[PDB]
Amino acid sequence: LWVTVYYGVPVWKDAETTLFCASHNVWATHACVPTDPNPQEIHLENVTEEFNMWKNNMVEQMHTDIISLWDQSLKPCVKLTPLCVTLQCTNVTNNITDDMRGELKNCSFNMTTELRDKKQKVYSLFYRLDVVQINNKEYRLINCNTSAITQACPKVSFEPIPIHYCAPAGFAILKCKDKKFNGTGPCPSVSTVQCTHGIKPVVSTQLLLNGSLAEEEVMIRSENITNNAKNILVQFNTPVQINCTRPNNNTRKSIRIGPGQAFYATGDIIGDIRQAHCNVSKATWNETLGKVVKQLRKHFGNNTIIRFANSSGGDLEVTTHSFNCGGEFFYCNTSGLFNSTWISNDSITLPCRIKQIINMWQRIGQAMYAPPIQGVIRCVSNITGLILTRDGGSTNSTTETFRPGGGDMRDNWRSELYKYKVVKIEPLGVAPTRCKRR
Amino acid sequence: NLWVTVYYGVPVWKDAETTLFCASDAKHNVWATHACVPTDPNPQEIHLENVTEEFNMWKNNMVEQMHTDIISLWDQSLKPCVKLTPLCVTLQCTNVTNNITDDMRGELKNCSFNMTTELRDKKQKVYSLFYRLDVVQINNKEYRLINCNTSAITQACPKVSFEPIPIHYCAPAGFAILKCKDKKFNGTGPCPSVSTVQCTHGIKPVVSTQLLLNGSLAEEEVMIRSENITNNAKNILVQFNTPVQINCTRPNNNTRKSIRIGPGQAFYATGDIIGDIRQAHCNVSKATWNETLGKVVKQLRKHFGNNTIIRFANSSGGDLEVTTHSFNCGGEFFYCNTSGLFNSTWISNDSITLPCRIKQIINMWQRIGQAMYAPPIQGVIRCVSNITGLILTRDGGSTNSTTETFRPGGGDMRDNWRSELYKYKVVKIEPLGVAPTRCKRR
Amino acid sequence: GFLGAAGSTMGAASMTLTVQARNLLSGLTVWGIKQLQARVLAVERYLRDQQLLGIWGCSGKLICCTNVPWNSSWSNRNLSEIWDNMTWLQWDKEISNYTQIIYGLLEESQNQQEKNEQD
Amino acid sequence: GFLGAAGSTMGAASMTLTVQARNLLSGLTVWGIKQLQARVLAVERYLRDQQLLGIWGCSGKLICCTNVPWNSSWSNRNLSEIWDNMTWLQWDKEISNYTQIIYGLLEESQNQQEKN
Amino acid sequence: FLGAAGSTMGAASMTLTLTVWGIKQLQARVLAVERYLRDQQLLGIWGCSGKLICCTNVPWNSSWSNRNLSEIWDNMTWLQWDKEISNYTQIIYGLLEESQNQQEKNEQDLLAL
Numbered sequence A: 001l002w003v004t005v006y007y008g009v010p011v012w013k014d015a016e017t018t019l020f021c022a023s024h025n026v027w028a029t030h031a032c033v034p035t036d037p038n039p040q041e042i043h044l045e046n047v048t049e050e051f052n053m054w055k056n057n058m059v060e061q062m063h064t065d066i067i068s069l070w071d072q073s074l075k076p077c078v079k080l081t082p083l084c085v086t087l088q089c090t091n092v093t094n095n096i097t098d099d100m101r102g103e104l105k106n107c108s109f110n111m112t113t114e115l116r117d118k119k120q121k122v123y124s125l126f127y128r129l130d131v132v133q134i135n136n137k138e139y140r141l142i143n144c145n146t147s148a149i150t151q152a153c154p155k156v157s158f159e160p161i162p163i164h165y166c167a168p169a170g171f172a173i174l175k176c177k178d179k180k181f182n183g184t185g186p187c188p189s190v191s192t193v194q195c196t197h198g199i200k201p202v203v204s205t206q207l208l209l210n211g212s213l214a215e216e217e218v219m220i221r222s223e224n225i226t227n228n229a230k231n232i233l234v235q236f237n238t239p240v241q242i243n244c245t246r247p248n249n250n251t252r253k254s255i256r257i258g259p260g261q262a263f264y265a266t267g268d269i270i271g272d273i274r275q276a277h278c279n280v281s282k283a284t285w286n287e288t289l290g291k292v293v294k295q296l297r298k299h300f301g302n303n304t305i306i307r308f309a310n311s312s313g314g315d316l317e318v319t320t321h322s323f324n325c326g327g328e329f330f331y332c333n334t335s336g337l338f339n340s341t342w343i344s345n346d347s348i349t350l351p352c353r354i355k356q357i358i359n360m361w362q363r364i365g366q367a368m369y370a371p372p373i374q375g376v377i378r379c380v381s382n383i384t385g386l387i388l389t390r391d392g393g394s395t396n397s398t399t400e401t402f403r404p405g406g407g408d409m410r411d412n413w414r415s416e417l418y419k420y421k422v423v424k425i426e427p428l429g430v431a432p433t434r435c436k437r438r
Numbered sequence B: 001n002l003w004v005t006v007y008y009g010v011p012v013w014k015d016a017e018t019t020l021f022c023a024s025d026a027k028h029n030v031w032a033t034h035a036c037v038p039t040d041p042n043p044q045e046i047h048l049e050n051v052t053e054e055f056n057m058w059k060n061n062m063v064e065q066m067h068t069d070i071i072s073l074w075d076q077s078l079k080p081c082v083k084l085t086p087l088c089v090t091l092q093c094t095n096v097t098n099n100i101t102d103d104m105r106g107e108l109k110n111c112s113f114n115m116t117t118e119l120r121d122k123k124q125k126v127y128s129l130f131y132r133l134d135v136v137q138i139n140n141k142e143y144r145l146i147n148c149n150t151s152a153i154t155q156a157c158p159k160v161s162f163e164p165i166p167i168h169y170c171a172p173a174g175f176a177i178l179k180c181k182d183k184k185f186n187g188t189g190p191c192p193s194v195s196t197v198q199c200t201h202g203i204k205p206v207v208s209t210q211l212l213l214n215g216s217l218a219e220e221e222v223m224i225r226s227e228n229i230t231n232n233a234k235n236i237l238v239q240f241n242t243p244v245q246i247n248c249t250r251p252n253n254n255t256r257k258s259i260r261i262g263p264g265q266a267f268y269a270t271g272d273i274i275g276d277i278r279q280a281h282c283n284v285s286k287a288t289w290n291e292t293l294g295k296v297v298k299q300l301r302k303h304f305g306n307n308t309i310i311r312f313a314n315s316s317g318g319d320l321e322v323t324t325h326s327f328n329c330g331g332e333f334f335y336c337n338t339s340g341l342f343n344s345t346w347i348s349n350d351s352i353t354l355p356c357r358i359k360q361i362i363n364m365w366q367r368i369g370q371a372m373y374a375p376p377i378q379g380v381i382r383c384v385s386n387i388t389g390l391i392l393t394r395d396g397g398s399t400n401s402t403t404e405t406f407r408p409g410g411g412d413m414r415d416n417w418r419s420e421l422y423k424y425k426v427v428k429i430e431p432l433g434v435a436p437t438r439c440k441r442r
Numbered sequence C: 001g002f003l004g005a006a007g008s009t010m011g012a013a014s015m016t017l018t019v020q021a022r023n024l025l026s027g028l029t030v031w032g033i034k035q036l037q038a039r040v041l042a043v044e045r046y047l048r049d050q051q052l053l054g055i056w057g058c059s060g061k062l063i064c065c066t067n068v069p070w071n072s073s074w075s076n077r078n079l080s081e082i083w084d085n086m087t088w089l090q091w092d093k094e095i096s097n098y099t100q101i102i103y104g105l106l107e108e109s110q111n112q113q114e115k116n117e118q119d
Numbered sequence D: 001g002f003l004g005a006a007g008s009t010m011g012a013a014s015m016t017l018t019v020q021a022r023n024l025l026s027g028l029t030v031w032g033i034k035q036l037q038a039r040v041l042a043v044e045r046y047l048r049d050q051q052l053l054g055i056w057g058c059s060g061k062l063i064c065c066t067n068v069p070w071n072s073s074w075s076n077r078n079l080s081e082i083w084d085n086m087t088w089l090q091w092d093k094e095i096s097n098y099t100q101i102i103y104g105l106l107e108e109s110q111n112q113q114e115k116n
Numbered sequence E: 001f002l003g004a005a006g007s008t009m010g011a012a013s014m015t016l017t018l019t020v021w022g023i024k025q026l027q028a029r030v031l032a033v034e035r036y037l038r039d040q041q042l043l044g045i046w047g048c049s050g051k052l053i054c055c056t057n058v059p060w061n062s063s064w065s066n067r068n069l070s071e072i073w074d075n076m077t078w079l080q081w082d083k084e085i086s087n088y089t090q091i092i093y094g095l096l097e098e099s100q101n102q103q104e105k106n107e108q109d110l111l112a113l
């Protein structure tokens, strides 16, 4: 037998490379390369590939790209450096309800004008979570000792847009088509694809929204299910509709703070003021929790009592379901959802709070001011997953407690990039053959 | 029997759009001609016999590329310069009446104000001379700059020159530039005489309205070019046979002062004019203009009728940039009143003087939010130029109109460079071909 | 010179292939990045053409003969009015419809030739 | 299509060399240099593989036959089940360690075949 | 590498076998690729691909250099030789291309019958 050389063999190895897109908005989908109108996909027969959900580099690349796009979209906007002054604030009265006593504040201050000589005296309505009292009373903005706020440009929209990540020449994307895959280990049913599907970068905590649903049964994933320091990702069989609203009729004022710079402040609510909230169903949530408990007992025995309790400790972003509903940032209290015990029509209402100075990506040093949205706001979304955590109950604990977690956004897009991997093609091979060169 | 045979290097091409780079003749200039690759001493042009190509002046990607490049260079050349944010204050202005003529009274203002020093806790009292077009009265009287409620001005860097320099546009490898060599081509249709080049000739990016200056001339006849001649919403590009000389001057003897407005930040104000005060103006010849207008009328009579009478009129409505002939005598921006030029009717020694005005806060490229302050120029200025074309517009005269009226136009600079790139197109080479032959591979 | 035989017949322009062959590879600021992508693009186009030639068995050749018979459905003109009464620019407009069929035929034929020769 | 014969045997995968040999050459903002550096790297990899093929005197071919004997110390399998009961992915794992030395032999013999 | 720079021509004929730094690296890579491709294409269009010494079909014109073969291969270096025939390089380069094209056409004609 003799050595024979083949160029064009179907062999690959695990690799790491930079992927590009295929698609006014924060995420510049208009600059990313156009998408192929025809989805190209080749099923791979009689091949099994090993996958690792918890060591995927696509997650890190997506995180970095999202953060960089966020940073880039904030450069040409107004800088609110003259906002860091002393404010004279008063409580808001005149048709406020019982559950809204002390959440809105009427603050007046002095402001610069388009001329460098003269100043104006203006006022605005602020949320109590945005102002810190200093020695009626006098306050200041919460970020005036750590960072400098930039006013988000009002024309851009915060609505996510699906993005497809493509592989360069010489690289391939392999997809696991198994419908009961748990993210780690061998996969019998494999295909190769050009680009990933439409993935929306939805930012939220404790709850996965507007994602994808499990095909047959609720999926439960973790890096080490017997280790309590690892988050547990739950994927739903069916979605749960949630209705979130802020029933206040707001106005927006424009203040000329410089030669070409405008500050968008809050005026006065035309009518009654009430609390923002969210609604979910009760029977649907009960059934979903029953299914999750049934799928949870395969790891902790068939006789353990499984109970859901609310979160405990941390900053306002971690202890609350935090999301963004049409330009306004909501932080909802979810103690009416994770409060139950399971032994071996109506609605659930989550009260929510609103902020306007936002620190994204867990960074210190950069903040953003979100201009008010005029009129009433409403939005409907699907709960398609959960992120839980387990406490270390020792000393012969026959009961388990799962409580909501989150805060790190890599687990959000790890739940959508779990059936994907990137490989490099090695097209040169040698084989023994029964011929010879003359 | 016949077989497919492959040929590599066949002379075939297609239409394409690509990134053309720049070449300039082998330092502070707005268009950074020092970063452009040097041009070969003698161009290599190849005349292509027996081939006829098709050209279109009005869908040409080179025009868009040139517009984008000019705007980008202009923006890039203004970044390291001084930001005049503290200049937006209240000014105390009085009329300048000292050795002035009656046609230039009320056009200059003597304005005093308070200014920041190099030290953050000190102030100074300074004064400057401003033009009436650059200040707004607010409630002697008190004024402010024209831009304090729209944008922020950036002082132009005083070592950067505004003079146009010829630019060559070159194609990458695998591309070519087809050049039409016909004389009676209107810029649309088949061109039966073609050559191929690697770079276009030297093109000067002159920014002006209503009049094309320092361009190229037609060789045999005055050329009228329009995208849709029977549509009155399309501009008419008129190319001359012989140029018309125009002399423009600003006679004042200006003085420049430097005011320190911060650590390493200077503001160049205007001091006092040494002598008398007079109006800036331009001069053209009357006989030459009459000859040119007669030739234009004769060549325009081939589109509208054998007998129709043709009359010209001045512009009507719009901002000062579009109603006047706007140009730049090497540092100073002129806005001249061209009303004695377009005033005549035609049926089938002396000079013409055009009074001009000077602005100092400039909004270029029809943009909003980015203004610019042009520092004053010391001494008397004078620039001499060739008129080599016109941009015209026709009035929509309905109801059995036997008269056609043409008025000067402009404002969009894509038409200024469409008149120089009208004979060029960019093509892509396809060197692979297949043909039948009796030859068979053994 | 370059493209000088663009109006010449298909037979007279077949002796100037090397003239067009060599003018295909070399023949931070605003102007800075407009020159690098041009070079990279030229290199990629040249490499694509070279690979296309190489996978047909015509690597390193200017005129290469193939084993694919000329299907008469593509064209029916005789050789006396193709190499003597036509030009490459005029010839391309006619057979621009059937190019990919011929490319696939050439690829499959060359691969079959290699496969049966190595056996 | 692309990588279609991944699970097919080594014999059946030798008829689809072009479908993968064709897709190795085609398919200052955030997405500015991620494109350019990747393009240059792909060009460099393709060129390196072409030079490596040229060293062994196989430039221009897909299947190349060589005179280097197959030593019975890399794989003891017979030429029956290799091309009928095995795949390229399984084959590459076994002889992955002995590749680099073979790349030496495949070169030297070539020059000898020219020297003789 | 460049070890025969001082030897005779005949002896040398036997042995022919972002950031500041990141921007500079890419230009070097592009330049290397460009030079390699240009040299390979120039060799290819002459019919000399795959060889280090290639015999051509173009007679030597005595006006290029009138020396005998004894004072070329036994008395000069390649750096000395390059200084003599530097003015005639492009003429020879065009002649080689025309000669190879004629060979291609003749091979086609031979296969035609």
Ligand SMILES: *[C@@H]1O[C@H](CO)[C@@H](O[C@@H]2O[C@H](CO)[C@@H](O[C@@H]3O[C@H](CO)[C@@H](O)[C@H](O[C@H]4O[C@H](CO)[C@@H](O)[C@H](O)[C@@H]4O)[C@@H]3O)[C@H](O)[C@H]2NC(C)=O)[C@H](O)[C@H]1NC(C)=O
Pocket (backbone or CB within 6 Å): A156, A157, A158, A159, A160, A202, A209, A210, A323, A324, A325, A326, A327, A378, A379, A380, A381, A382
């Ligand atoms: C999960 O997905 C759902 C469904 O896509 C999504 O709800 C949608 O939210 C968007 C954004 O808030 C809503 O679109 C707005 O709806 C009304 C009516 O059109 C208007 O307020 C808005 O138009 C104004 O604002 C735009 C901002 O860019 C401007 O461009 C425009 O000119 C107008 O000024 C805007 O269209 C949309 O209606 C809902 N859809 C439904 C069915 O409710 C939800 O937000 C997602 N969930 C999460 C958590 O992201």
Ligand SMILES: *[C@@H]1O[C@H](CO)[C@@H](O[C@@H]2O[C@H](CO)[C@@H](O[C@@H]3O[C@H](CO)[C@@H](O)[C@H](O[C@H]4O[C@H](CO)[C@@H](O)[C@H](O)[C@@H]4O)[C@@H]3O)[C@H](O)[C@H]2NC(C)=O)[C@H](O)[C@H]1NC(C)=O
Pocket (backbone or CB within 6 Å): B160, B161, B162, B163, B164, B206, B213, B214, B327, B328, B329, B330, B382, B383, B384, B385, B386
């Ligand atoms: C059409 O073309 C004509 C002819 O080229 C052109 O007129 C020219 O204008 C330039 C710019 O104003 C003149 O050059 C200036 O001339 C004098 C004497 O040399 C000086 O004022 C200038 O030098 C000072 O300014 C420079 C600014 O960059 C500095 O670099 C320099 O150090 C000096 O401070 C400058 O040289 C030139 O003389 C005329 N030419 C003629 C023949 O009049 C005209 O402007 C063009 N038309 C248009 C609309 O562009």
Ligand SMILES: *[C@@H]1O[C@H](CO)[C@@H](O[C@@H]2O[C@H](CO)[C@@H](O)[C@H](O)[C@H]2NC(C)=O)[C@H](O)[C@H]1NC(C)=O
Pocket (backbone or CB within 6 Å): A092, A093, A094, A106, A108, A123, A268, A269
């Ligand atoms: C916030 O306070 C401002 C004053 O600081 C209130 O606006 C004034 O309301 C009074 C009473 O109706 C009017 O007479 C004034 O003309 C208003 N303007 C000013 C500038 O004083 C405003 O109503 C308060 N808003 C809320 C929601 O309490």
Ligand SMILES: *[C@@H]1O[C@H](CO)[C@@H](O[C@@H]2O[C@H](CO)[C@@H](O)[C@H](O)[C@H]2NC(C)=O)[C@H](O)[C@H]1NC(C)=O
Pocket (backbone or CB within 6 Å): A243, A244, A245, A278, A279, A347, A349
């Ligand atoms: C969330 O659910 C609550 C409770 O059903 C809704 O509040 C009711 O709203 C209706 C009008 O739509 C009123 O007639 C009822 O009196 C309200 N009930 C209570 C207890 O206050 C609320 O509208 C729902 N919100 C959304 C966005 O669905």
Ligand SMILES: *[C@@H]1O[C@H](CO)[C@@H](O[C@@H]2O[C@H](CO)[C@@H](O)[C@H](O)[C@H]2NC(C)=O)[C@H](O)[C@H]1NC(C)=O
Pocket (backbone or CB within 6 Å): A333, A334, A335, A336
């Ligand atoms: C989330 O909501 C729960 C109730 O749904 C809040 O718990 C109540 O807190 C109040 C004080 O705000 C106590 O008086 C009640 O006794 C608590 N109720 C129960 C049932 O324990 C909880 O504080 C909310 N979370 C917040 C505000 O962060």
Ligand SMILES: *[C@@H]1O[C@H](CO)[C@@H](O[C@@H]2O[C@H](CO)[C@@H](O)[C@H](O)[C@H]2NC(C)=O)[C@H](O)[C@H]1NC(C)=O
Pocket (backbone or CB within 6 Å): B096, B097, B098, B110, B112, B127, B272, B273
């Ligand atoms: C513009 O006004 C300034 C003062 O604001 C004038 O300069 C003064 O002129 C008077 C009269 O000759 C002198 O006594 C002062 O010393 C000058 N300087 C100052 C700082 O007051 C200037 O002459 C005026 N210019 C014009 C053209 O009218």
Ligand SMILES: *[C@@H]1O[C@H](CO)[C@@H](O[C@@H]2O[C@H](CO)[C@@H](O)[C@H](O)[C@H]2NC(C)=O)[C@H](O)[C@H]1NC(C)=O
Pocket (backbone or CB within 6 Å): B136, B149, B150
């Ligand atoms: C900036 O100020 C100028 C000058 O006052 C404004 O121009 C005036 O705009 C008003 C709008 O009602 C018109 O009635 C006037 O006729 C304008 N005056 C002139 C001289 O043109 C301009 O609108 C202001 N710009 C902005 C953005 O507020």
Ligand SMILES: *[C@@H]1O[C@H](CO)[C@@H](O[C@@H]2O[C@H](CO)[C@@H](O)[C@H](O)[C@H]2NC(C)=O)[C@H](O)[C@H]1NC(C)=O
Pocket (backbone or CB within 6 Å): B214, B243, B385, B386
């Ligand atoms: C303006 O028009 C004049 C007159 O046609 C041009 O001057 C000619 O320039 C050429 C080239 O240097 C000379 O050969 C001619 O002798 C000049 N003519 C005369 C009458 O002197 C001039 O070049 C044109 N362009 C500019 C920018 O001024």
Ligand SMILES: *[C@@H]1O[C@H](CO)[C@@H](O[C@@H]2O[C@H](CO)[C@@H](O)[C@H](O)[C@H]2NC(C)=O)[C@H](O)[C@H]1NC(C)=O
Pocket (backbone or CB within 6 Å): B247, B248, B249, B281, B282, B283, B351, B353
């Ligand atoms: C433009 O033409 C005018 C009018 O001919 C010129 O003004 C004359 O200038 C001369 C000196 O050159 C004076 O003696 C005359 O009295 C002026 N005439 C008038 C009516 O004022 C002017 O110089 C010309 N300007 C240019 C730049 O050519």
Ligand SMILES: *[C@@H]1O[C@H](CO)[C@@H](O[C@@H]2O[C@H](CO)[C@@H](O)[C@H](O)[C@H]2NC(C)=O)[C@H](O)[C@H]1NC(C)=O
Pocket (backbone or CB within 6 Å): B337, B338, B339, B340
């Ligand atoms: C341009 O100049 C002409 C004259 O050359 C101006 O027309 C004159 O305008 C004044 C008032 O400004 C009238 O008194 C005259 O009767 C007008 N003359 C004629 C012949 O109509 C014209 O207004 C100027 N254009 C401007 C200032 O925009």
Ligand SMILES: *[C@@H]1O[C@H](CO)[C@@H](O)[C@H](O)[C@H]1NC(C)=O
Pocket (backbone or CB within 6 Å): A091, A102
């Ligand atoms: C005013 O606001 C303070 C600060 O939150 C709150 O404690 C207090 O109850 C309010 N009092 C009145 C009289 O509105």
Ligand SMILES: *[C@@H]1O[C@H](CO)[C@@H](O)[C@H](O)[C@H]1NC(C)=O
Pocket (backbone or CB within 6 Å): A086, A087, A088, A108, A109, A110
């Ligand atoms: C605003 O300025 C006024 C006038 O100097 C002063 O009385 C007041 O305390 C300042 N601050 C405010 C209203 O917060």
Ligand SMILES: *[C@@H]1O[C@H](CO)[C@@H](O)[C@H](O)[C@H]1NC(C)=O
Pocket (backbone or CB within 6 Å): A132, A145, A146
């Ligand atoms: C900023 O002020 C807040 C509120 O008093 C305080 O908790 C925080 O520590 C301060 N931050 C820094 C960096 O000093």
Ligand SMILES: *[C@@H]1O[C@H](CO)[C@@H](O)[C@H](O)[C@H]1NC(C)=O
Pocket (backbone or CB within 6 Å): A182, A183, A184, A185, A186, A221, A222, A223, A224, A225
């Ligand atoms: C996923 O399944 C694999 C076997 O396919 C198993 O090794 C692994 O532990 C599972 N992961 C879990 C149960 O979290």
Ligand SMILES: *[C@@H]1O[C@H](CO)[C@@H](O)[C@H](O)[C@H]1NC(C)=O
Pocket (backbone or CB within 6 Å): A210, A239, A381, A382
């Ligand atoms: C939410 O769920 C509904 C019902 O299954 C479905 O039609 C819809 O597409 C889902 N997604 C969104 C973004 O509403």
Ligand SMILES: *[C@@H]1O[C@H](CO)[C@@H](O)[C@H](O)[C@H]1NC(C)=O
Pocket (backbone or CB within 6 Å): A224, A226, A227
């Ligand atoms: C999972 O966690 C348990 C408990 O801490 C530990 O003993 C075990 O080694 C972990 N498994 C792995 C694979 O690291």
